[PDB]
Amino acid sequence: SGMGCIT
Amino acid sequence: SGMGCIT
Amino acid sequence: SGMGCIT
Amino acid sequence: SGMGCIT
Amino acid sequence: SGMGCIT
Amino acid sequence: SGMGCIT
Amino acid sequence: SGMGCIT
Amino acid sequence: SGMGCIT
Amino acid sequence: SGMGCIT
Amino acid sequence: SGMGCIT
């Protein structure tokens, strides 16, 4: 249950 | 249950 | 149940 | 149950 | 249950 | 369940 | 379940 | 469940 | 469950 | 569950 943002 | 955004 | 966006 | 967008 | 942002 | 973009 | 874009 | 962007 | 961006 | 950005 993971989320990643490289913005 | 993962989500990834490279913006 | 994954979603990926390379924007 | 996956979805991918390369925008 | 992790989330990462490289902004 | 992989996606790659060389932009 | 892979997708690749060389843009 | 990986995604890569070389921008 | 990895993502990489070389920007 | 790793993410890398070389900006």
Numbering used by the authors:
A (entry chain A), B (entry chain A), C (entry chain A), D (entry chain A), E (entry chain A), F (entry chain A), ...: 58 to 64
Sentences from the paper on this structure:
For experimental validation, we selected three of these KRT8 mutants (G62C, Y54H, and G55A), all of which are found in people with cryptogenic liver disease, as well as three FUS mutants (G191S, G225V, and G230C). To assess the structural impacts of the disease-associated mutations, we determined the atomic structures of several LARKS from KRT8 for both the wild-type and mutant sequences. Segment crystal structures of KRT858–64 (wild type: SGMGGIT; G62C: SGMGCIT) for the wild-type protein and KRT8-G62C were determined. The G62C mutant fibril is a parallel beta-sheet, whose steric-zipper interface is driven by hydrophobic interactions between Met60, Cys62, and Ile63. c, The KRT852–58-G55A mutant structure GGYAGAS was also determined, revealing an anti-parallel beta-sheet with a steric-zipper interface formed by Tyr54, Ala55, and Ala57. d, Alignment of the wild-type and mutant KRT858–64 segments shows a transition in backbone conformation from a highly extended to a pleated beta-sheet at the site of the mutation (circled). Alignment of the beta-strands from both structures highlights that the G62C mutation results in the non-pleated Gly62 converting to a pleated conformation as Cys62 (shown in inset). e, Comparison of the KRT852-58-G55A GGYAGAS segment with a structure from hnRNPA1 whose sequences closely match the corresponding KRT8 wild-type (hnRNPA1: GGGYGGS versus KRT8: GGYGGAS) shows a similar trend in transitioning from an extended beta-sheet in the wild type to a pleated conformation in the mutant. From these fibril structures, we observe that both the G62C and G55A mutations in KRT8 convert a non-pleated beta-sheet into a pleated one, transitioning a LARKS-like conformation into a steric zipper. Suggesting an effect of alcohol on KRT8 aggregation, two of three of our crystal structures of KRT8 segments showed the peptides in complex with either ethanol or isopropanol, each with distinct binding sites.
Although other intermediate filament proteins have been demonstrated to form amyloids, KRT8 specifically has not previously been characterized as an amyloid-forming protein. This protein, like other alpha-keratin proteins, contains a central coiled-coil domain that is flanked by an amino-terminal head domain and a carboxy-terminal tail domain, which are both low complexity in sequence composition. KRT8 is known to aggregate pathologically, primarily in the form of MDBs in liver disease. Atomic structures of KRT8 LARKS reveal that pathogenic mutations convert the non-pleated wild-type protein into a pleated conformation, shedding light on the molecular mechanisms underlying aggregation-promoting mutations in low-complexity proteins.
